[PDB]
Design an enzyme around this catalytic site. Sequence first.
Site, PDB file in Angstrom:
ATOM      1  N   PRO A   1       0.851  -1.255   0.008  1.00  0.00           N
ATOM      2  CA  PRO A   1       0.028   0.044  -0.063  1.00  0.00           C
ATOM      3  C   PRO A   1       0.811   1.304  -0.043  1.00  0.00           C
ATOM      4  CG  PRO A   1      -0.762  -1.411   1.532  1.00  0.00           C
ATOM      5  CD  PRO A   1       0.147  -2.297   0.569  1.00  0.00           C
ATOM      6  N   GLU A   2       0.721   2.001  -0.957  1.00  0.00           N
ATOM      7  CA  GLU A   2       1.216   3.308  -1.066  1.00  0.00           C
ATOM      8  C   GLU A   2       0.408   4.442  -0.232  1.00  0.00           C
ATOM      9  OE1 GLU A   2       2.593   2.942  -5.255  1.00  0.00           O
ATOM     10  OE2 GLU A   2       3.746   4.824  -4.946  1.00  0.00           O
ATOM     11  N   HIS A  94      -5.860 -15.459   8.455  1.00  0.00           N
ATOM     12  CA  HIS A  94      -5.056 -14.241   8.275  1.00  0.00           C
ATOM     13  C   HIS A  94      -5.880 -12.958   8.779  1.00  0.00           C
ATOM     14  CE1 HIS A  94      -2.990 -16.703   5.810  1.00  0.00           C
ATOM     15  NE2 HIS A  94      -4.082 -17.091   5.136  1.00  0.00           N
ATOM     16  N   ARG A 113       0.339 -11.911   5.040  1.00  0.00           N
ATOM     17  CA  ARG A 113       1.408 -12.097   5.364  1.00  0.00           C
ATOM     18  C   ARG A 113       2.346 -11.491   6.559  1.00  0.00           C
ATOM     19  NH1 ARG A 113       3.594 -14.867   0.630  1.00  0.00           N
ATOM     20  NH2 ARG A 113       2.451 -14.106  -1.245  1.00  0.00           N
TER      21      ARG A 113
END
Length: 252
Positions: A1-2, A94, A113
Amino acid sequence: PELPEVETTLRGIAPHIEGKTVEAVVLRQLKLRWQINPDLGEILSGRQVLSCGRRAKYLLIRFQTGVLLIHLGMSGSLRIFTPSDGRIGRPDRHDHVDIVFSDGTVMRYRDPRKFGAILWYEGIEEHHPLLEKLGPEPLSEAFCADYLYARLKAQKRAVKLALMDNAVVVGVGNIYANESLFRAGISPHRPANRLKKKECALLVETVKAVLQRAIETYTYGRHNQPCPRCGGLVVKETLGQRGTFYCPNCQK
Ligand SMILES: [Zn+2]
Protein backbone atom coordinates in the site's frame (compact mmCIF):
# COMPACT_ATOMS: atom_id res chain seq x y z
CA PRO A 1 0.00 0.00 0.00
CA GLU A 2 1.23 3.45 -1.02
CA LEU A 3 0.17 6.79 0.48
CA PRO A 4 -3.10 7.26 -1.51
CA GLU A 5 -4.19 3.70 -0.68
CA VAL A 6 -3.80 4.47 3.03
CA GLU A 7 -5.62 7.78 2.53
CA THR A 8 -8.67 6.09 0.98
CA THR A 9 -8.55 3.47 3.74
CA LEU A 10 -8.68 6.36 6.22
CA ARG A 11 -11.59 8.01 4.42
CA GLY A 12 -13.45 4.69 4.28
CA ILE A 13 -12.92 3.94 7.97
CA ALA A 14 -13.24 7.37 9.64
CA PRO A 15 -17.06 7.81 9.41
CA HIS A 16 -17.93 4.29 10.56
CA ILE A 17 -15.94 4.46 13.82
CA GLU A 18 -15.44 8.14 14.76
CA GLY A 19 -17.36 8.85 17.96
CA LYS A 20 -18.00 5.18 18.77
CA THR A 21 -17.09 3.36 21.99
CA VAL A 22 -14.91 0.25 21.94
CA GLU A 23 -16.79 -2.67 23.51
CA ALA A 24 -14.06 -5.31 23.10
CA VAL A 25 -10.86 -6.14 21.20
CA VAL A 26 -10.40 -9.73 20.02
CA LEU A 27 -6.75 -10.60 19.37
CA ARG A 28 -6.10 -13.68 17.24
CA GLN A 29 -2.42 -12.80 16.77
CA LEU A 30 0.17 -10.96 18.85
CA LYS A 31 3.24 -10.94 16.56
CA LEU A 32 3.21 -9.10 13.23
CA ARG A 33 6.26 -7.10 12.23
CA TRP A 34 6.24 -5.88 15.83
CA GLN A 35 4.58 -7.41 18.87
CA ILE A 36 1.02 -6.32 19.60
CA ASN A 37 0.31 -5.14 23.13
CA PRO A 38 -1.26 -8.33 24.54
CA ASP A 39 -3.73 -6.42 26.64
CA LEU A 40 -5.40 -4.04 24.16
CA GLY A 41 -8.89 -5.14 25.23
CA GLU A 42 -8.78 -3.55 28.68
CA ILE A 43 -6.88 -0.56 27.27
CA LEU A 44 -9.49 0.31 24.63
CA SER A 45 -12.73 -1.07 26.12
CA GLY A 46 -15.14 1.71 27.07
CA ARG A 47 -13.01 4.60 25.78
CA GLN A 48 -14.54 6.47 22.84
CA VAL A 49 -12.44 7.02 19.73
CA LEU A 50 -11.98 10.78 19.61
CA SER A 51 -10.65 11.20 16.08
CA CYS A 52 -8.89 9.46 13.19
CA GLY A 53 -6.15 10.60 10.85
CA ARG A 54 -3.05 9.64 8.93
CA ARG A 55 0.65 10.44 8.62
CA ALA A 56 2.68 8.85 5.80
CA LYS A 57 1.76 5.11 5.68
CA TYR A 58 0.49 5.02 9.29
CA LEU A 59 -3.18 5.17 10.27
CA LEU A 60 -3.79 6.91 13.61
CA ILE A 61 -6.82 6.30 15.83
CA ARG A 62 -6.63 9.01 18.51
CA PHE A 63 -8.35 8.29 21.85
CA GLN A 64 -8.33 10.29 25.10
CA THR A 65 -5.50 8.23 26.66
CA GLY A 66 -3.29 7.59 23.62
CA VAL A 67 -3.18 6.73 19.93
CA LEU A 68 -3.39 3.45 18.02
CA LEU A 69 -1.00 3.24 15.06
CA ILE A 70 -1.86 0.75 12.31
CA HIS A 71 0.56 -0.08 9.49
CA LEU A 72 -0.85 -2.29 6.75
CA GLY A 73 2.62 -2.93 5.36
CA MET A 74 2.73 -4.95 2.15
CA SER A 75 -0.52 -6.94 2.31
CA GLY A 76 -2.60 -5.41 5.10
CA SER A 77 -6.17 -4.16 4.96
CA LEU A 78 -9.07 -3.23 7.21
CA ARG A 79 -12.78 -3.88 6.80
CA ILE A 80 -15.91 -2.57 8.51
CA PHE A 81 -18.92 -4.74 9.37
CA THR A 82 -22.01 -2.65 10.12
CA PRO A 83 -24.68 -4.57 12.08
CA SER A 84 -27.34 -3.28 9.68
CA ASP A 85 -25.63 -5.15 6.81
CA GLY A 86 -25.41 -8.88 6.19
CA ARG A 87 -23.61 -11.35 8.43
CA ILE A 88 -20.12 -11.20 9.94
CA GLY A 89 -18.31 -13.98 8.11
CA ARG A 90 -16.32 -16.30 10.35
CA PRO A 91 -12.67 -15.21 10.75
CA ASP A 92 -9.60 -16.49 8.92
CA ARG A 93 -6.04 -17.64 9.43
CA HIS A 94 -5.27 -14.09 8.24
CA ASP A 95 -7.88 -12.08 10.20
CA HIS A 96 -5.73 -11.25 13.21
CA VAL A 97 -7.47 -8.35 15.02
CA ASP A 98 -11.14 -7.61 15.66
CA ILE A 99 -12.39 -4.39 17.27
CA VAL A 100 -16.00 -4.74 18.45
CA PHE A 101 -17.91 -1.57 19.29
CA SER A 102 -21.09 -1.31 21.34
CA ASP A 103 -22.82 0.07 18.23
CA GLY A 104 -22.30 -3.35 16.62
CA THR A 105 -19.71 -2.09 14.15
CA VAL A 106 -16.71 -4.42 13.90
CA MET A 107 -13.30 -3.46 12.49
CA ARG A 108 -11.35 -6.45 11.16
CA TYR A 109 -7.64 -6.32 10.30
CA ARG A 110 -6.43 -8.78 7.67
CA ASP A 111 -2.77 -9.37 6.79
CA PRO A 112 -2.07 -12.70 5.04
CA ARG A 113 1.68 -11.98 5.12
CA LYS A 114 1.84 -10.86 8.78
CA PHE A 115 3.80 -7.71 7.92
CA GLY A 116 1.73 -4.85 9.35
CA ALA A 117 1.84 -3.49 12.89
CA ILE A 118 -0.64 -2.54 15.63
CA LEU A 119 1.03 -0.28 18.20
CA TRP A 120 -0.45 1.55 21.18
CA TYR A 121 1.29 4.82 22.03
CA GLU A 122 0.67 6.92 25.15
CA GLY A 123 2.48 10.13 24.27
CA ILE A 124 3.06 12.73 21.58
CA GLU A 125 2.74 11.74 17.93
CA GLU A 126 5.38 14.36 17.07
CA HIS A 127 8.02 12.24 18.84
CA HIS A 128 7.03 8.71 17.83
CA PRO A 129 10.12 6.71 16.77
CA LEU A 130 8.48 5.74 13.46
CA LEU A 131 7.12 9.27 12.88
CA GLU A 132 9.60 11.97 13.97
CA LYS A 133 12.06 11.77 11.06
CA LEU A 134 9.27 12.44 8.55
CA GLY A 135 8.80 15.54 6.44
CA PRO A 136 5.59 17.48 5.90
CA GLU A 137 2.68 15.71 4.35
CA PRO A 138 1.67 16.40 0.76
CA LEU A 139 -1.99 17.53 0.69
CA SER A 140 -0.95 19.96 3.46
CA GLU A 141 -0.03 23.63 3.43
CA ALA A 142 3.19 22.74 5.27
CA PHE A 143 4.45 21.72 1.80
CA CYS A 144 5.19 25.15 0.32
CA ALA A 145 7.76 26.47 -2.12
CA ASP A 146 9.83 28.06 0.63
CA TYR A 147 10.03 24.79 2.57
CA LEU A 148 11.37 22.96 -0.49
CA TYR A 149 13.80 25.77 -1.34
CA ALA A 150 15.16 25.77 2.21
CA ARG A 151 15.25 21.95 2.22
CA LEU A 152 17.24 21.64 -1.02
CA LYS A 153 19.78 24.39 -0.28
CA ALA A 154 21.81 21.97 1.88
CA GLN A 155 22.08 18.69 -0.05
CA LYS A 156 22.12 18.44 -3.84
CA ARG A 157 21.78 14.84 -4.84
CA ALA A 158 19.64 14.36 -7.93
CA VAL A 159 16.07 15.60 -7.51
CA LYS A 160 14.67 12.06 -7.48
CA LEU A 161 16.76 11.00 -4.48
CA ALA A 162 15.47 13.96 -2.47
CA LEU A 163 11.87 13.60 -3.62
CA MET A 164 11.76 9.91 -2.64
CA ASP A 165 13.29 10.74 0.76
CA ASN A 166 10.62 10.40 3.46
CA ALA A 167 12.49 12.97 5.56
CA VAL A 168 12.07 15.60 2.83
CA VAL A 169 8.39 14.81 2.20
CA VAL A 170 6.34 11.67 2.75
CA GLY A 171 4.54 9.35 0.35
CA VAL A 172 5.97 10.00 -3.12
CA GLY A 173 7.30 6.65 -4.32
CA ASN A 174 8.82 5.90 -7.73
CA ILE A 175 5.67 6.33 -9.84
CA TYR A 176 4.55 9.67 -8.41
CA ALA A 177 8.11 11.02 -8.36
CA ASN A 178 8.62 10.27 -12.06
CA GLU A 179 5.21 11.60 -13.08
CA SER A 180 5.53 14.79 -11.01
CA LEU A 181 9.07 15.50 -12.18
CA PHE A 182 8.02 15.25 -15.82
CA ARG A 183 4.86 17.35 -15.39
CA ALA A 184 6.99 20.02 -13.71
CA GLY A 185 9.78 19.87 -16.28
CA ILE A 186 12.59 20.00 -13.70
CA SER A 187 14.52 16.78 -14.67
CA PRO A 188 15.52 13.91 -12.34
CA HIS A 189 19.29 14.60 -12.50
CA ARG A 190 19.21 18.34 -11.77
CA PRO A 191 21.21 19.31 -8.67
CA ALA A 192 18.69 19.80 -5.87
CA ASN A 193 20.38 23.03 -4.74
CA ARG A 194 20.39 24.60 -8.21
CA LEU A 195 16.62 24.84 -8.54
CA LYS A 196 14.96 28.01 -7.27
CA LYS A 197 11.67 29.10 -5.74
CA LYS A 198 9.93 29.63 -9.09
CA GLU A 199 10.34 25.93 -9.91
CA CYS A 200 10.00 24.55 -6.38
CA ALA A 201 6.52 26.11 -6.24
CA LEU A 202 5.41 24.50 -9.49
CA LEU A 203 6.98 21.18 -8.47
CA VAL A 204 5.20 21.01 -5.11
CA GLU A 205 1.99 21.98 -6.91
CA THR A 206 2.43 19.23 -9.51
CA VAL A 207 3.28 16.71 -6.77
CA LYS A 208 0.08 17.66 -4.95
CA ALA A 209 -1.90 17.30 -8.19
CA VAL A 210 -0.40 13.91 -9.11
CA LEU A 211 -1.10 12.62 -5.58
CA GLN A 212 -4.63 14.09 -5.41
CA ARG A 213 -5.54 12.35 -8.66
CA ALA A 214 -3.81 9.20 -7.37
CA ILE A 215 -6.41 9.15 -4.57
CA GLU A 216 -9.44 9.53 -6.89
CA THR A 217 -9.67 5.77 -7.39
CA TYR A 218 0.42 7.43 -17.22
CA THR A 219 2.45 9.99 -19.19
CA TYR A 220 6.47 6.18 -16.49
CA GLY A 221 7.21 2.99 -18.42
CA ARG A 222 6.96 5.10 -21.58
CA HIS A 223 10.61 4.89 -22.67
CA ASN A 224 11.04 4.83 -26.45
CA GLN A 225 7.60 6.42 -26.86
CA PRO A 226 7.17 10.07 -27.90
CA CYS A 227 6.52 12.59 -25.13
CA PRO A 228 3.05 14.19 -24.86
CA ARG A 229 4.39 17.78 -24.84
CA CYS A 230 7.77 17.98 -26.60
CA GLY A 231 7.31 14.66 -28.35
CA GLY A 232 10.81 13.65 -27.48
CA LEU A 233 12.47 10.36 -27.01
CA VAL A 234 12.00 9.84 -23.30
CA VAL A 235 14.73 7.64 -21.90
CA LYS A 236 14.94 5.07 -19.12
CA GLU A 237 17.80 5.05 -16.61
CA THR A 238 18.49 3.06 -13.46
CA LEU A 239 20.16 5.72 -11.30
CA GLY A 240 18.76 6.07 -7.82
CA GLN A 241 18.51 2.26 -7.49
CA ARG A 242 15.06 2.59 -9.09
CA GLY A 243 13.71 3.10 -12.58
CA THR A 244 13.70 6.58 -14.09
CA PHE A 245 11.82 8.03 -17.06
CA TYR A 246 12.12 11.59 -18.37
CA CYS A 247 12.17 13.72 -21.53
CA PRO A 248 15.74 14.95 -22.21
CA ASN A 249 14.37 17.74 -24.46
CA CYS A 250 12.06 19.32 -21.84
CA GLN A 251 13.28 18.98 -18.33
CA LYS A 252 16.69 20.79 -18.25
ZN1 LIG B 1 9.23 16.41 -23.76
